[PDB]
Amino acid sequence: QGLMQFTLPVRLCKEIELFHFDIGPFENMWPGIFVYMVHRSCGTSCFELEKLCRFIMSVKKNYRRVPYHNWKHAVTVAHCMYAILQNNHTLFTDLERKGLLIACLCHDLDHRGFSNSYLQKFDHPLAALYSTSTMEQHHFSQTVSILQLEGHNIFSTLSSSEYEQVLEIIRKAIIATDLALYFGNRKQLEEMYQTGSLNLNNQSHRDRVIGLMMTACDLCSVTKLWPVTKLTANDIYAEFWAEGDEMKKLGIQPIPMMDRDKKDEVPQGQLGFYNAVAIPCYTTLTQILPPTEPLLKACRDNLSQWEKVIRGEETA
Ligand SMILES: Cn1ncc(C(=O)NC2CC2)c1C(=O)Nc1ccn2cc(-c3ccccc3)nc2c1
Ligand SMILES: [Mg+2]
Ligand SMILES: [Zn+2]
Numbered sequence: 001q002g003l004m005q006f007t008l009p010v011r012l013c014k015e016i017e018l019f020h021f022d023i024g025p026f027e028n029m030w031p032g033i034f035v036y037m038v039h040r041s042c043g044t045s046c047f048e049l050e051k052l053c054r055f056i057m058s059v060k061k062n063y064r065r066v067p068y069h070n071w072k073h074a075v076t077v078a079h080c081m082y083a084i085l086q087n088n089h090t091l092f093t094d095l096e097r098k099g100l101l102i103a104c105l106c107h108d109l110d111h112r113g114f115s116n117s118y119l120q121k122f123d124h125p126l127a128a129l130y131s132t133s134t135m136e137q138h139h140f141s142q143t144v145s146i147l148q149l150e151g152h153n154i155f156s157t158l159s160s161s162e163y164e165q166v167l168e169i170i171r172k173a174i175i176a177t178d179l180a181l182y183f184g185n186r187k188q189l190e191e192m193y194q195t196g197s198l199n200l201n202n203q204s205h206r207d208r209v210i211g212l213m214m215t216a217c218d219l220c221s222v223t224k225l226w227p228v229t230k231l232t233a234n235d236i237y238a239e240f241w242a243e244g245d246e247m248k249k250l251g252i253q254p255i256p257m258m259d260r261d262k263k264d265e266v267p268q269g270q271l272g273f274y275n276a277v278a279i280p281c282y283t284t285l286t287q288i289l290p291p292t293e294p295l296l297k298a299c300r301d302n303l304s305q306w307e308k309v310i311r312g313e314e315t316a
Contacts, residue, residue: 069111099169109142176211
């Protein structure tokens with residue numbers, strides 16, 4: 001008798017299936033939205049509800065009150081993964097469904113709103129511990145610490161070898177969110193797709209596809225309706241500009257996107273980001289996973305919005 005099913009109001013029940021769904025401003029509804037997505041994408045028996053709830057609330061507590069890399073971003077990235085999984089349900093394993101929504105929820109644990117570059121320039125202790133993907137190795141380590149709390153082992157029914165596999169899916173998925181690694185990963189996938197060598201039975205290939213899925217989920221603000229896209233950009237720059245201030249305090253000239261004095265160049269910066277990162281990301285994903293097309297369509301629609309801003313037909 002596991003007859004306690006999670007339900008959502010009618011609008012949320014329908015719209016959560018859309019790639020461009022926004023999870024809304026009611027923080028207290030996000031745990032329920034996450035459980036609902038786990039129950040539908042994994043199954044009601046994937047996790048003990050009590051342990052999963054305790055886990056969710058400890059993850060929330062270890063996100064910080066920062067403008068962008070916060071609890072809302074964690075659930076937002078998990079929702080984009082939910083939509084990819086639900087529209088490609090025959091392509092993933094039992095352990096991949098169990099691991100990937102958890103990886104998305106945890107992927108920015110204990111973020112302070114600073115890049116790997118800032119931690120290196122600051123000489124933060126984390127940069128000595130983890131020389132590459134500094135924050136991402138920290139996010140994984142935070143994930144392990146939480147899974148090891150009493151009553152928090154959500155994978156308790158897995159064998160030692162299966163637990164190890166799911167922790168390895170999570171580790172690689174979280175590390176893949178280091179955008180420095182995305183450029184190389186997408187190039188390899190594009191090469192593998194265009195030569196017809198890409199093989200979803202090859203684990204090292206599955207790792208690359210999951211990595212690109214993680215990038216796609218992580219950047220998914222560019223795949224929302226324009227008003228969501230535009231408002232989320234404010235939170236992104238709130239963080240970039242705070243880091244730029246901190247770079248200036250260290251006596252280092254920040255890169256342009258982190259300099260608040262360069263505010264008027266944001267529309268052109270966005271255009272650069274969409275052309276160099278977002279459009280290629282969703283293009284390669286759509287080639288590998290054709291049902292993810294709505295992400296690419298929404299990204300192209302937002303690219304056209306930023307062009308309208310640059311021409312002075314829209315105001316930001
Ligand atoms: C929308 N989105 N979602 C995720 C990221 C992202 O990268 N997040 C980091 C990974 C955590 C962005 C993003 O907005 N990224 C960028 C990227 C490059 N830029 C350059 C300029 C620019 C500004 C003024 C002047 C000149 C340039 N602005 C940008 C913004
Ligand atoms: Mg991150
Ligand atoms: Zn993120």
